Coordinates of C-alpha atoms (C1' of nucleotides) and ligand atoms in Angstrom, one line a residue:
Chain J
X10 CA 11.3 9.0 -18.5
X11 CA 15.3 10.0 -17.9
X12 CA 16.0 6.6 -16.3
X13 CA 13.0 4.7 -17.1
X14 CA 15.0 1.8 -18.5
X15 CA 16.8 1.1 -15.4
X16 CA 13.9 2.1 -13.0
X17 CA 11.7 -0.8 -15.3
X18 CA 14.8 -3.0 -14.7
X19 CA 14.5 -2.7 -11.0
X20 CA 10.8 -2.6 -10.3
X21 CA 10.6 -6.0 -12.5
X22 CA 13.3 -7.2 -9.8
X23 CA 11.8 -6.1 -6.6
X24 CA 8.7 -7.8 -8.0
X25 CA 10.6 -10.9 -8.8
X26 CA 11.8 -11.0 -5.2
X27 CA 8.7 -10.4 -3.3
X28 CA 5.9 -12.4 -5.9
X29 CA 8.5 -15.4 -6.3
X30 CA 11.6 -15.6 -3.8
X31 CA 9.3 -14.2 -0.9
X32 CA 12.0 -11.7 0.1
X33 CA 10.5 -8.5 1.3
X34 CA 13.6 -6.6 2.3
X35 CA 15.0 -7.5 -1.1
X36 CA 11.5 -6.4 -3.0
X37 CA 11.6 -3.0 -0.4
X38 CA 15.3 -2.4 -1.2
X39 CA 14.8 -2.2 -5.1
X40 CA 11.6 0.0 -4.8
X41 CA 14.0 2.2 -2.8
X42 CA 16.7 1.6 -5.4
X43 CA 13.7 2.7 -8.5
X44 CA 12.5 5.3 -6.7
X45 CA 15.7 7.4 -5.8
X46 CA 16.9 7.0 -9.5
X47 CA 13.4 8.2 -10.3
X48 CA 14.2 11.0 -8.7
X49 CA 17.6 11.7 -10.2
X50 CA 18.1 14.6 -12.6
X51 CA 20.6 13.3 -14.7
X52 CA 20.2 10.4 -17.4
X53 CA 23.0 7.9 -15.5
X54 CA 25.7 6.7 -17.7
X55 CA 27.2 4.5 -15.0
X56 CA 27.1 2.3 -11.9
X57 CA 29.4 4.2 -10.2
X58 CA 27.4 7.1 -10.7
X59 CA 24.6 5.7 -9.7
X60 CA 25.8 4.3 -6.7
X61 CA 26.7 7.9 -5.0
X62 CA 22.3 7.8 -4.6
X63 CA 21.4 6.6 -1.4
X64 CA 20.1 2.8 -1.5
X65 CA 21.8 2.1 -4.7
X66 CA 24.5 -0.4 -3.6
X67 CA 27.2 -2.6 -5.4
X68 CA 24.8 -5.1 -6.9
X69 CA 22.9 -2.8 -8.4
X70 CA 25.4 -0.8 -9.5
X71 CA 26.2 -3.7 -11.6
X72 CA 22.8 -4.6 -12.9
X73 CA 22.8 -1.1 -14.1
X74 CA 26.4 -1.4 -15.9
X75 CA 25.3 -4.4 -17.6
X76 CA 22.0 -3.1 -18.4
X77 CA 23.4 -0.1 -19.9
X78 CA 26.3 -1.5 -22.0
X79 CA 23.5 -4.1 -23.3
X80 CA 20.2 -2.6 -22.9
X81 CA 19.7 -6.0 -21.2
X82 CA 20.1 -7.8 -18.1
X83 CA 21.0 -11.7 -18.6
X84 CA 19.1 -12.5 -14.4
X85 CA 15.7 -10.9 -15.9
X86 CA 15.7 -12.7 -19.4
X87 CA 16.0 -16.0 -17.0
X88 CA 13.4 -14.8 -14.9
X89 CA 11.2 -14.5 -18.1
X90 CA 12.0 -17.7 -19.7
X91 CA 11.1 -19.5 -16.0
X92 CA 7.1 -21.0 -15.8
X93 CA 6.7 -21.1 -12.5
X94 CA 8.1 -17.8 -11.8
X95 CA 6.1 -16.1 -15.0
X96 CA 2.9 -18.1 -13.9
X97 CA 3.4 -17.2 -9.9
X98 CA 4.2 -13.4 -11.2
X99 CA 0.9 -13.4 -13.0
X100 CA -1.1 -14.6 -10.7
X101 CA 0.0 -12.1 -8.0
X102 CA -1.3 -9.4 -10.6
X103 CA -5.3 -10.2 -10.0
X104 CA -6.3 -8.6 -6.2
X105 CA -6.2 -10.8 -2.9
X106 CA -3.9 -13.5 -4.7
X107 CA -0.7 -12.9 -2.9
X108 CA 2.6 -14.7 -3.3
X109 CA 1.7 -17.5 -1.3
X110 CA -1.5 -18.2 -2.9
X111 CA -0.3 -17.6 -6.1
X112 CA 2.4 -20.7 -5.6
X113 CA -0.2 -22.7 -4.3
X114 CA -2.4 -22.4 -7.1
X115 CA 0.6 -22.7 -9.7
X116 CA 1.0 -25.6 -7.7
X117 CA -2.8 -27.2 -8.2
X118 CA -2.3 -26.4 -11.8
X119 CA -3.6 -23.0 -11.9
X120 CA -1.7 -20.7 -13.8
X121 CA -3.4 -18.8 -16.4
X122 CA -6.8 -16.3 -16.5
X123 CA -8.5 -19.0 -17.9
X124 CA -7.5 -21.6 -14.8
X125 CA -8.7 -19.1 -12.1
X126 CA -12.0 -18.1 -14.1
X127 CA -12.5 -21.7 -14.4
X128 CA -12.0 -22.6 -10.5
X129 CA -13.8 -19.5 -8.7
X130 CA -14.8 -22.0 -6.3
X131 CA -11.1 -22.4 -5.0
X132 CA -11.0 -18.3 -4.4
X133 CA -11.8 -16.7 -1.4
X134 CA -14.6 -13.7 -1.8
X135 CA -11.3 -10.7 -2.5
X136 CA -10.2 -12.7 -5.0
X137 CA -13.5 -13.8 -6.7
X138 CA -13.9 -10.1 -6.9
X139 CA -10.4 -9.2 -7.5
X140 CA -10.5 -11.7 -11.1
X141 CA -13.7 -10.8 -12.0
X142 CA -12.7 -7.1 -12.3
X143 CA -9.0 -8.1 -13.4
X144 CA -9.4 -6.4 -16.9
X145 CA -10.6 -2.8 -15.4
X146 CA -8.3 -2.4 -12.8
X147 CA -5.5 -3.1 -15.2
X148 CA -6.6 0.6 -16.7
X149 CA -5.8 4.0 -15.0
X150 CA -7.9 7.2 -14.0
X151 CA -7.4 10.1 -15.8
X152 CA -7.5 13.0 -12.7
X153 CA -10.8 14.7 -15.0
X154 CA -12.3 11.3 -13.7
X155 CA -11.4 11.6 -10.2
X156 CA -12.7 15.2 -10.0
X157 CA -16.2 13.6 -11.1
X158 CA -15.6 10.7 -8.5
X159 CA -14.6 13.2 -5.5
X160 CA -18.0 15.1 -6.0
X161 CA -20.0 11.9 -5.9
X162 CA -18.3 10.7 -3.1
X163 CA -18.2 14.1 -1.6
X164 CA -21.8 15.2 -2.2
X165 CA -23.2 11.7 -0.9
X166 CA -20.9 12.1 2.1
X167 CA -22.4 15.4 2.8
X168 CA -25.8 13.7 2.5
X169 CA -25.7 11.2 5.1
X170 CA -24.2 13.7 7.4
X171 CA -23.1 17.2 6.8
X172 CA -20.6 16.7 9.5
X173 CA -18.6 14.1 7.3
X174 CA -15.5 15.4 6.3
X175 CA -14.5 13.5 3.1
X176 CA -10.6 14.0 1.4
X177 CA -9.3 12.1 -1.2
X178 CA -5.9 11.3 -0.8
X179 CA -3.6 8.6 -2.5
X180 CA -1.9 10.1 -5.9
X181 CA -4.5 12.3 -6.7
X182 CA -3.7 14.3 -3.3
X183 CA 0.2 14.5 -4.9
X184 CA -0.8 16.0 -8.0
X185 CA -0.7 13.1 -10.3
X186 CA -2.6 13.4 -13.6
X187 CA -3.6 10.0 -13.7
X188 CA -4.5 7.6 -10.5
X189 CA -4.9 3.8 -9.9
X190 CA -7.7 4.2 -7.7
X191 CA -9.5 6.3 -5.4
X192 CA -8.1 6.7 -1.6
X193 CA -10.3 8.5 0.5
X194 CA -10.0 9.4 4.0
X195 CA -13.1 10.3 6.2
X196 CA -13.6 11.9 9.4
X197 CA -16.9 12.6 11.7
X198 CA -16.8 14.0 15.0
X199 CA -18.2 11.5 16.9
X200 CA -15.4 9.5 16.6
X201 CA -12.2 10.4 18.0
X202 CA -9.1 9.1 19.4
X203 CA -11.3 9.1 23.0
X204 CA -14.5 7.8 22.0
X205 CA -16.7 6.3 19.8
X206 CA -19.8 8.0 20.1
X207 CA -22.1 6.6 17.0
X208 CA -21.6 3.1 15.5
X209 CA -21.8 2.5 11.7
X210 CA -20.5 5.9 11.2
X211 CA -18.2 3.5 8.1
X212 CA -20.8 1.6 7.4
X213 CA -23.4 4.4 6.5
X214 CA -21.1 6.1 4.3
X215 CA -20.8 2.6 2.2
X216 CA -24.3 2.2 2.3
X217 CA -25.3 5.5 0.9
X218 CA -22.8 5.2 -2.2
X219 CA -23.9 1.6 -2.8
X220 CA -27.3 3.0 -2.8
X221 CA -26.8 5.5 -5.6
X222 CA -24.8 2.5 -7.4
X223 CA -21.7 4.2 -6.9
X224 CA -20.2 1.4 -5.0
X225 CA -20.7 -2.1 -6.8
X226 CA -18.4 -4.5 -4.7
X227 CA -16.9 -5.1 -1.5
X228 CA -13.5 -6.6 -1.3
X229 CA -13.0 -6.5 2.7
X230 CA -14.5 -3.7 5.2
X231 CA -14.4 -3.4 9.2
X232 CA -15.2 -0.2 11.2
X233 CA -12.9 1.9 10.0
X234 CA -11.4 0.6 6.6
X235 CA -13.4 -0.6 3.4
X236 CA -12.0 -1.8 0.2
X237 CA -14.3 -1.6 -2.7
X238 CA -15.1 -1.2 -6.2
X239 CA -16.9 1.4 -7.7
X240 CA -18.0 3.3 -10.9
X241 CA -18.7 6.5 -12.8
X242 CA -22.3 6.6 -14.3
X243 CA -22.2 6.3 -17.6
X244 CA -24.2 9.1 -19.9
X245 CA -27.0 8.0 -22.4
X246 CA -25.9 5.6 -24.9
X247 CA -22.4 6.1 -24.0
X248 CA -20.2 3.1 -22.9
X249 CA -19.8 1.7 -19.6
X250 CA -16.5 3.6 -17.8
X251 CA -14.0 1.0 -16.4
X252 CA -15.3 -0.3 -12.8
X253 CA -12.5 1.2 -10.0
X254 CA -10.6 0.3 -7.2
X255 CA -11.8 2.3 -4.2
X256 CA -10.2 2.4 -0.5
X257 CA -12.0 4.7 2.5
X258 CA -10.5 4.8 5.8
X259 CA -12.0 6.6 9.0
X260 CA -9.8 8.1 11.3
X261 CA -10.0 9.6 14.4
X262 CA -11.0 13.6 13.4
X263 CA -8.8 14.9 16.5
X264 CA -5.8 12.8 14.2
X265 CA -6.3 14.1 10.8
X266 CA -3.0 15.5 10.6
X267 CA -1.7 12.5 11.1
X268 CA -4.3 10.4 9.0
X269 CA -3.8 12.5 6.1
X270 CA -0.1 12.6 6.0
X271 CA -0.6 8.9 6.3
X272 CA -2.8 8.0 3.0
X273 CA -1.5 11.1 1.6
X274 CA 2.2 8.6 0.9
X275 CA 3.1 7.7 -1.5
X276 CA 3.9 4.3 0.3
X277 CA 7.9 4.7 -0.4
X278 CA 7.7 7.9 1.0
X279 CA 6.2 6.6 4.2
X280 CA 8.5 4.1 4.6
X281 CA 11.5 6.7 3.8
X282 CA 10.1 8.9 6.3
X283 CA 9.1 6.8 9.2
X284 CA 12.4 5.2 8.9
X285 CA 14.1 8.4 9.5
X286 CA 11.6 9.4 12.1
X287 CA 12.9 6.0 13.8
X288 CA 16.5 7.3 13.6
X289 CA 15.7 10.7 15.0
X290 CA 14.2 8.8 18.0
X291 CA 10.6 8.9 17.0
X292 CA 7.9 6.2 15.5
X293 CA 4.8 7.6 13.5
X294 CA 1.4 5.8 11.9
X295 CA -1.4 7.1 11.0
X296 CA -2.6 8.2 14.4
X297 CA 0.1 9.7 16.4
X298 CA 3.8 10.6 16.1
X299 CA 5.0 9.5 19.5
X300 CA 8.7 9.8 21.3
X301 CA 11.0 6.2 21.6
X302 CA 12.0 5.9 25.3
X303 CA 15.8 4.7 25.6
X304 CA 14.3 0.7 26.3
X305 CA 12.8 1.3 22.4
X306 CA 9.3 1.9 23.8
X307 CA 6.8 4.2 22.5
X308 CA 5.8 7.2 25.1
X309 CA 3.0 9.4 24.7
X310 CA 1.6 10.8 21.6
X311 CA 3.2 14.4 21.0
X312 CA 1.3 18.0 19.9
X313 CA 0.2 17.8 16.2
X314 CA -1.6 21.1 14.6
X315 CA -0.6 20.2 11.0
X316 CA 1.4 18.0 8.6
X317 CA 4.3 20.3 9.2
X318 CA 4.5 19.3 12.7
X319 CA 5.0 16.0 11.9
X320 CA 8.1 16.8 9.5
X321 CA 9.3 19.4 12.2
X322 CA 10.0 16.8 15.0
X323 CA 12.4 15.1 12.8
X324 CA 14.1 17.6 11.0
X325 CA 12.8 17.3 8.2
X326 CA 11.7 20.7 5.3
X327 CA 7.8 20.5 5.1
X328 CA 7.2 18.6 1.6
X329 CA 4.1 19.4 -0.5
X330 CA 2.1 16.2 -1.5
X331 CA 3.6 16.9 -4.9
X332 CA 7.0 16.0 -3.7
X333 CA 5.7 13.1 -2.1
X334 CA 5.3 10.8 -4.9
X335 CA 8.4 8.2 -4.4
Chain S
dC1 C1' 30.5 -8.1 9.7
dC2 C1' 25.6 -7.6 11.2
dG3 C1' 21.0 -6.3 12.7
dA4 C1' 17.4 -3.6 11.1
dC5 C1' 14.5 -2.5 7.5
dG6 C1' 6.9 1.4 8.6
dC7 C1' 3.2 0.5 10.6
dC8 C1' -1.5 -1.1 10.9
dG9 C1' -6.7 -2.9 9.2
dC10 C1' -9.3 -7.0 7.7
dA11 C1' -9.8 -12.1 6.3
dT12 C1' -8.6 -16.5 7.1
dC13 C1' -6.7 -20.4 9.7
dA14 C1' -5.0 -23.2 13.6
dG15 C1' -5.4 -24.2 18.1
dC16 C1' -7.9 -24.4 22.5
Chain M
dG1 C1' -16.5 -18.4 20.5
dC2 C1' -11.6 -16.3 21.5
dT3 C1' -6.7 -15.5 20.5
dG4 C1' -2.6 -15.1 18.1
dA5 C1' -0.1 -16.3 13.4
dT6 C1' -0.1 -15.5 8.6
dG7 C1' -1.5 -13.5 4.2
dC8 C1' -2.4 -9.5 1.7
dG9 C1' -3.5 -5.1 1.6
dG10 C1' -3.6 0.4 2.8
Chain H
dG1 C1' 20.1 -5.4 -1.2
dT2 C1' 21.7 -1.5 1.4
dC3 C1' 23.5 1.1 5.1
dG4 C1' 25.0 2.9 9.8
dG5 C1' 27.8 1.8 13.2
Ligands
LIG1 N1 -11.3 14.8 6.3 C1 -11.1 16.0 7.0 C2 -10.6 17.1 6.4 C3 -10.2 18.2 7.2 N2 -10.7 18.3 8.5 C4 -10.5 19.5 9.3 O1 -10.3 20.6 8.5 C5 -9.1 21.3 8.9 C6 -8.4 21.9 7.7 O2 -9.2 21.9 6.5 P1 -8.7 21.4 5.1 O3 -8.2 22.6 4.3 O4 -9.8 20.6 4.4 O5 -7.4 20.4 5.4 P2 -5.9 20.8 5.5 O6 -5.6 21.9 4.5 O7 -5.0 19.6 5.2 O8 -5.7 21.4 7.0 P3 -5.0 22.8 7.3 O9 -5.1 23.7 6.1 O10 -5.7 23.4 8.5 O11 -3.6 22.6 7.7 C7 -8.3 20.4 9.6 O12 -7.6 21.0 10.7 C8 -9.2 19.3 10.1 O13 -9.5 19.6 11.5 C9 -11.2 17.1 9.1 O14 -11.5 17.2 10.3 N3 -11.4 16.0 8.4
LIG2 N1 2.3 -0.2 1.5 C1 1.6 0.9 1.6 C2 0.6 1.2 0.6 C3 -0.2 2.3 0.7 N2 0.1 3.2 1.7 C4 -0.7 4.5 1.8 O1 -1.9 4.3 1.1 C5 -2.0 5.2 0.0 C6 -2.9 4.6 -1.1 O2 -2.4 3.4 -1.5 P1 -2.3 3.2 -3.1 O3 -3.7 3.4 -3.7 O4 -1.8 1.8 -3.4 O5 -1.2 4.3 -3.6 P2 -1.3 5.5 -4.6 O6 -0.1 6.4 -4.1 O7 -2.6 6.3 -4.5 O8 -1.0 5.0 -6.0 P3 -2.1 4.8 -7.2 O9 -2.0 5.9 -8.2 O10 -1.6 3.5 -7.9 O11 -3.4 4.5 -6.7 C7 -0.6 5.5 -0.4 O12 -0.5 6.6 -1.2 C8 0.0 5.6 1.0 O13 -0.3 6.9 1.5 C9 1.1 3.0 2.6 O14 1.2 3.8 3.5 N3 1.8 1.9 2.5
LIG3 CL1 14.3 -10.5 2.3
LIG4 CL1 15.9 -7.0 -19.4
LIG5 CL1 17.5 -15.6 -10.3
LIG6 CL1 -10.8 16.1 -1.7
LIG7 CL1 -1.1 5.4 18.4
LIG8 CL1 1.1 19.4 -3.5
LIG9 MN1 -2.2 1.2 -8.2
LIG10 MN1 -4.4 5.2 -4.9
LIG11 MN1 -5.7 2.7 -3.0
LIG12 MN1 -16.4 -3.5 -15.8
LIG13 MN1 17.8 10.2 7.6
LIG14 MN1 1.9 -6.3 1.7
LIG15 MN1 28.5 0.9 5.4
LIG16 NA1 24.7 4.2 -2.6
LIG17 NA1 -2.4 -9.6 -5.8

DNA sequence: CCGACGCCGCATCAGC
DNA sequence: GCTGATGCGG
DNA sequence: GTCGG
């Protein structure tokens, strides 16, 4: 892409900072850094032109001089060369091994594929699942794959009952032609932001695409949000496809708008736009958008009857999903 | 300079 | 068992 | 690491 050397740059930083030096703000601010340069429509021949983009500071600026006058930048090839930080990086790369666990098992002497596959024992069940499927979820979904996942998922949805209402969010809701996973949100009108009326109404819906081998794996799930793995069926002699990431959430139906707008992201753009929701004097999550009182204390949740409410109350243009991906 | 940085579900642990 | 901190994830 | 105040 335009920038893609310097967005690389910076994504390979934030990662440094949040996998290794356990700085979030640091890992957030470079994502934000990556993702308005992303965004930019010129190919930047500067730091000082990059800095005019919000988020880009001085030390970036910087990075970026040096990276462009070299093609290189001097704190990454350290980074590289380091063990612990390559091994503690890698480790973070297979699902459930965070930063913490990761230095603890670099620690123990873990610190390769072959280490953790031969020490399942010293993994928790997300992580036993998250190595064993480490090769497949390195690969991505082309979107001709998610249209034949949404209709399974939609049609078994519809067959436990026909008052389901299943969307599939994530990237695919923005538009993109190839996904990570599958993000799915589910409603039901028995549950609402003022009642549970049936229990299991998650559960069911798990039950019935494990049923039809859909779902193969479990990685965590509670009443309203399940984190799985999953797979197309294959066709007659034709080879297995890659097993998938899958995440369903059930949200109250009243609070779709909300809910949608919510897994819809990307997860930059949340944080960009709840931020500025927070300086307009408002705080949203996936439920509500609600008013901050003067103390800083949430008041009651305000009218929403669409997405374009939400971006309404803090001044904000309506943005297609399309224009969401940050 | 500096305080804030999105907001919440599920798994695991420490403590009682 | 419960409750609140921490990890890791959406 | 950045930015508003
Ligand atoms: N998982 C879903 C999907 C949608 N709906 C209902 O369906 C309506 C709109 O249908 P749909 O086109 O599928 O969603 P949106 O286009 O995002 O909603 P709208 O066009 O009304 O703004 C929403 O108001 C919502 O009440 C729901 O309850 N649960
Ligand atoms: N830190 C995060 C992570 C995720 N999300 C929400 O959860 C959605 C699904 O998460 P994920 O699958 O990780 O993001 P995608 O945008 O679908 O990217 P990918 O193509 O890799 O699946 C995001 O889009 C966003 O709406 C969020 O709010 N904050
Ligand atoms: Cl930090
Ligand atoms: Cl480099
Ligand atoms: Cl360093
Ligand atoms: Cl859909
Ligand atoms: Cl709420
Ligand atoms: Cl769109
Ligand atoms: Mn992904
Ligand atoms: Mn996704
Ligand atoms: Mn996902
Ligand atoms: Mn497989
Ligand atoms: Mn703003
Ligand atoms: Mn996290
Ligand atoms: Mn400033
Ligand atoms: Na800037
Ligand atoms: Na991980």
């Amino acid at each position: 892409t335009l920038n893609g050397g310097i967005t690389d740059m910076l994504t390979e930083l934030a990662n440094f900072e949040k996998n290794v030096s356990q700085a979030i703000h640091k890992y957030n601010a470079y994502r934000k850094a990556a993702s308005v340069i992303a965004k930019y429509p010129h190919k930047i021949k500067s730091g000082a032109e990059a800095k005019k983009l919000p988020g880009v500071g001085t030390k970036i600026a910087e990075k970026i001089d040096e990276f462009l006058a070299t093609g290189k930048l001097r704190k990454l090839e350290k980074i590289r060369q380091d063990d612990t930080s390559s091994s503690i990086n890698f480790l973070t790369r297979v699902s459930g091994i965070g930063p913490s666990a990761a230095r603890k098992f670099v620690d123990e002497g873990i610190k390769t594929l072959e280490d953790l596959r031969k020490n399942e024992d010293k993994l928790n069940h997300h992580q036993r699942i998250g190595l064993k499927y480490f090769g497949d979820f390195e690969k991505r979904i082309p979107r001709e794959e998610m249209l034949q996942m949404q209709d399974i998922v939609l049609n078994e949805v519809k067959k436990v009952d026909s008052e389901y209402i299943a969307t599939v969010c994530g990237s695919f809701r923005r538009g993109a032609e190839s996904s990570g996973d599958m993000d799915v949100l589910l409603t039901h009108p028995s549950f609402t932001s003022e009642s549970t009326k049936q229990p299991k109404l998650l559960h069911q819906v798990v039950e019935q695409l494990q049923k039809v081998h859909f779902i193969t794996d479990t990685l965590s799930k509670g009443e309203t949000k399940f984190m799985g793995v999953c797979q197309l069926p294959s066709k007659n002699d034709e080879k297995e496809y890659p097993h998938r990431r899958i995440d369903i959430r059930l949200i109250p139906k009243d609070q779709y708008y909300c809910g949608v707008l919510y897994f819809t992201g990307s997860d930059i753009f949340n944080k960009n736009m709840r931020a500025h929701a927070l300086e307009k004097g408002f705080t949203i999550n996936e439920y509500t958008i609600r008013p901050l009182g003067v103390t800083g204390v949430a008041g009651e949740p305000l009218p929403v009857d669409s997405e374009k409410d939400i971006f309404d109350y803090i001044q904000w243009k309506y943005r297609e999903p399309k224009d969401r991906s940050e």
